[PDB]
Amino acid sequence: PQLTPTLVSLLEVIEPEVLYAGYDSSVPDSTWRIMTTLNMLGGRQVIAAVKWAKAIPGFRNLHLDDQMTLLQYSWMYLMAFALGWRSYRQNLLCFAPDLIINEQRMTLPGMYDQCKHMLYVSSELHRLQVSYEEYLCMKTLLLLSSVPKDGLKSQELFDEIRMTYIKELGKAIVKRQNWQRFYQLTKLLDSMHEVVENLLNYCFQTFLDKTMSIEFPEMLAEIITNQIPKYSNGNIKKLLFHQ
Amino acid sequence: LTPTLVSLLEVIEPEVLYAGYDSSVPDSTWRIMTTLNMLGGRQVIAAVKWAKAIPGFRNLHLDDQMTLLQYSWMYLMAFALGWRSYRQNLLCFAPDLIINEQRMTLPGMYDQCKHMLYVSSELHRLQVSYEEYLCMKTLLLLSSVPKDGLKSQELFDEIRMTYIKELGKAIVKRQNWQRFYQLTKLLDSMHEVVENLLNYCFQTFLDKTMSIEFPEMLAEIITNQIPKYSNGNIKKLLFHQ
Amino acid sequence: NALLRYLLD
Amino acid sequence: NALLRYLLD
Ligand SMILES: C[C@@H]1C[C@H]2[C@@H]3C[C@H](F)C4=CC(=O)C=C[C@]4(C)[C@@]3(F)[C@@H](O)C[C@]2(C)[C@@]1(OC(=O)c1ccco1)C(=O)SCF
Ligand SMILES: C[C@@H]1C[C@H]2[C@@H]3C[C@H](F)C4=CC(=O)C=C[C@]4(C)[C@@]3(F)[C@@H](O)C[C@]2(C)[C@@]1(OC(=O)c1ccco1)C(=O)SCF
């Protein structure tokens, strides 16, 4: 029938295979150890997300500096959202098939304190009973949810790409009461800014802390350094579906 | 922003697989062949994951999906091999098993490898672009049917015609009709290449005196396909009579 | 060939 | 950040 492929079905194939953490099961668990193992995983997850974004039609056509800004602004949204999905498809947290934060690990010192935020995303997906195709449009929009105060360099093209995926999600919803579910799902998107703020707050604070000894891979460290000034000056604009 | 059928073929193109060839043990024609069969099996598994993602293909009847893979696996393997070698005079089975000038001279080696070299040289000669390769490879999946016809023959026909047009488009976005003729003429000649490669493949499989091992993924296909060349129930689709 | 039928489902 | 710039190119 449709031997010409929908934008959704393209996103379906470009979705990167899920990465293992490499966490050792013989060594005892620790908050120190889990966080570091998670940071390393985070780095490889970002490299995957770059390859992913480049495959999004239109994206590779933005200014290269814009492509950078979008990935720098949105990496945490993408990671947290995908986490929420993984956790929903398997209330626990599936960072990786080999590193699941279960009931017991949750009780580790300083653990649930951050995990509550990531759990929130996961319980929203289960609540709203989100489908896979909806998910793929939502994550795409998450790549496009923040911009600098005075816009991007290819603002027009960006505006048009974003407008495209808003429509794409609308199709996902119907292909599955319409406009209310749209509200619902776009309200979840809006509320990612609040999740990410918390997650980034703890991330930056840990990154900058002298006596904390938690390692970060270079991939993440360059971005964290490249963003701390921007967020602590206010050049970020959070694009909201509802004012 | 609208994705083309060709941009989708790009995405679904599988990762290139390593052969796991030990580079510290003397080469022999037994060791190379056996290793390549093993590789071949994993490549077939990949091709299935690839076909399933080609738009339309998963909409065929399941028996038809099976038939086409059983008929065309050698076309898909040989053609990808041509491409890998073309992109390197040599044969790039894998980044860890390249048949250099040295390995070429081994007993019975060049005898078969000349057929796979042919594909590789034709791609160089015609200087084929990637997007053409991707359309051509998709047509190769659709290059033989049971003489009796497929079950979803109607839909198959539409799928094939789409990828012909698609190949056509790739040529335009690259003398256009001439090139279209030349590239379809190459596809046609893949039949001859594959016949040669399958003959020795089947001949080896059936020979008891050769201790050449085949992985089960391949052995099942080969077993299933032996009779259909013996009863001649295969129709080779050609662009030029 | 059952293995092929499987990978295709 | 050159590595990202590189991975994007
Ligand atoms: C609170 C932050 C946020 C954490 C990241 C969340 C993100 F969703 C993610 C998903 C992954 O699959 C792998 C890694 C990350 C990118 C992430 F989990 C890690 O880097 C760690 C981050 C920054 C974070 O997590 C924790 O404290 C944490 C995880 C479990 C309990 O606490 C850190 O700041 S790690 C210390 F810097
Ligand atoms: C002549 C046959 C055909 C060979 C296959 C060709 C195919 F193109 C291919 C490409 C690969 O990248 C990996 C494997 C295969 C599928 C293949 F090379 C192997 O299985 C071996 C096959 C069946 C074949 O190859 C040779 O003679 C050969 C290759 C190099 C030297 O001799 C055999 O019949 S191996 C013994 F049965």
DSSP states along A190-203: HTHHHHHHHHHHHH
- Nearest C-alpha neighbor of B222 from the set B238, B206, B239, B211: B206
B149 sits in which H/E element: none
Distance from Cα A58 to the centre of ligand 1, integer Å: 30
Neighbours of B218 (CB within 10 A): 19
- What's the rounded Cα separation, in Å, for the pair B188 and B184? 6
Q: Which ligand is nearest to the CA of B118?
A: 2
Alpha-carbon dihedral sign for residues B12, A8, B1, D4:
negative
Instruction: List residues of B whose CB lies inside 8 A of any C CB.
Output: 45, 48-49, 52, 62, 65-66, 69-70, 216-217, 220-221, 223-224
Query: Contact B68/B159 with Cβ under 8 angstroms?
Result: no
Give the distance from CA A123 to its chain's centroid. Answer: 15
Chain C residues 1-9 within an 8 A CB cutoff of chain B: 1, 3-5, 7-9
What does each C-alpha distance from A29 to A23, A25, A37, A99 come to in angstroms? 10, 8, 11, 11
Q: Inspect the interface and report whether the beta carbons of C4 and B48 lie closer than 8 Å.
A: yes
B65 interaction partners in chain C (CB closer than 8 Å)? 8
Q: Cβ neighbours of residue B111 under 8 Å, at least 6 residues apart?
A: none
Resolution (A): 2.8
- What's the rounded Cα separation, in Å, for the pair B240 and B185? 7
Residue type, B52: K
Query: Contact A122/A91 with Cβ under 8 angstroms?
Result: yes
d(CA A51, nearest CA chain D) in Å: 8
Q: Which ligand is nearest to the CA of B140?
A: 2
Counting CB pairs under 8 A, whether chains D and C reach 3 or more, is no
What does each C-alpha distance from A169 to A178, A186, B136 come to in angstroms? 11, 9, 34
User: B211 in helix, strand or coil?
Assistant: coil
- Tokens encoding A103: 């009931």
B7 interaction partners in chain A (CB closer than 8 Å)? 10, 57
Q: Cβ neighbours of residue B164 under 8 Å, at least 6 residues apart?
A: B139
A60 close to B (CB below 8 A) = no
- What's the rounded Cα separation, in Å, for the pair B86 and B102? 18
- What's the rounded Cα separation, in Å, for the pair A87 and A84? 5
Q: CA dihedral in degrees (B134, B138, B139, B145; nearest 10)?
A: 160
DSSP track, B19-73: ----TTS---HHHHHHHHHHHHHHHHHHHHHHHTTSTTGGGS-HHHHHHHHHHHH
Q: Which residue of A has its CA nearest to D5?
A: A68
DSSP track, B133-148: HHHHHHHHTTSEEETT
- What's the rounded Cα separation, in Å, for the pair A192 and A77? 7
A205 close to B (CB below 8 A) = no
Query: Contact A195/A80 with Cβ under 8 angstroms?
Result: yes
Best C3, C4, C5 residue to mutate vs chain B (most B CBs within 10 Å):
C4
Domain of A195, CATH number, reads 1.10.565.10
- Nearest CB partner across the interface for D7, out of A47, A218, A226: A47
- The one-character DSSP state at B94 is E
- Tokens encoding A144: 């496009």
Q: Cβ neighbours of residue B200 under 8 Å, at least 6 residues apart?
A: B112
- Start-to-end CA distance of chain B, whole Å, equals 40
User: Kindly report the CA angle at A101 between A97 and A104, in degrees rounded to 5?
Assistant: 135
Closest protein CA for atom 12 of ligand 1: A95
- What's the rounded Cα separation, in Å, for the pair B80 and B119? 9
d(CA B52, nearest CA chain C) in Å: 7
DSSP track, chain A: ---S--HHHHHHHHSPPPPP----SSSPP-HHHHHHHHHHHHHHHHHHHHHHHHTSTTGGGS-HHHHHHHHHHHHHHHHHHHHHHHHHH---EEEETTEEE-HHHHTSTTTHHHHHHHHHHHHHHHHTT--HHHHHHHHHHHTTSEEETT--TTHHHHHHHHHHHHHHHHHHHHH--HHHHHHHHHHHHHTHHHHHHHHHHHHHHHHH-GGG-----HHHHHHHHHHHHHHTTT-EEE--S--
- Nearest C-alpha neighbor of B239 from the set B172, B184, B186: B184
Method: X-ray
- What's the rounded Cα separation, in Å, for the pair B198 and B76? 13
- Start-to-end CA distance of chain A, whole Å, equals 41
How do beta strands B97-99 and B91-94 pair? antiparallel
What does each C-alpha distance from A153 to A60, A72, A158, A164 come to in angstroms? 14, 15, 9, 19
Q: Maximum Cα–Cα distance for chain B, whole Å?
A: 58
d(CA D9, nearest CA chain A) in Å: 8
If one counts the domains in chain A, the total is 1
B91 sits in which H/E element: strand B91-94
B216 sits in which H/E element: helix B216-230
- What's the rounded Cα separation, in Å, for the pair A230 and A73? 9
Neighbours of chain D (3+ CB pairs under 8 A): A
d(CA A243, nearest CA chain D) in Å: 33
- The one-character DSSP state at B106 is S
- Nearest C-alpha neighbor of B89 from the set B113, B58, B61: B113
Q: Inspect the interface and report whether the beta carbons of A64 and D7 lie closer than 8 Å.
A: no
Counting CB pairs under 8 A, whether chains B and A reach 3 or more, is yes
Q: Inspect the interface and report whether the beta carbons of D4 and A71 lie closer than 8 Å.
A: yes
B168 close to A (CB below 8 A) = no
Q: Which ligand is nearest to the CA of A21?
A: 1
Scan for tokens 């290449």, then name that residue: B193
Best of A23, A36, A38 for a ligand 1 pocket test (most atoms within 8 Å of beta carbon): A38
Best B69, B214, B223 residue to mutate vs chain C (most C CBs within 10 Å):
B69
Scan for tokens 């393997």, then name that residue: B77
In terms of residue numbers, what domain contains B166?
1-241
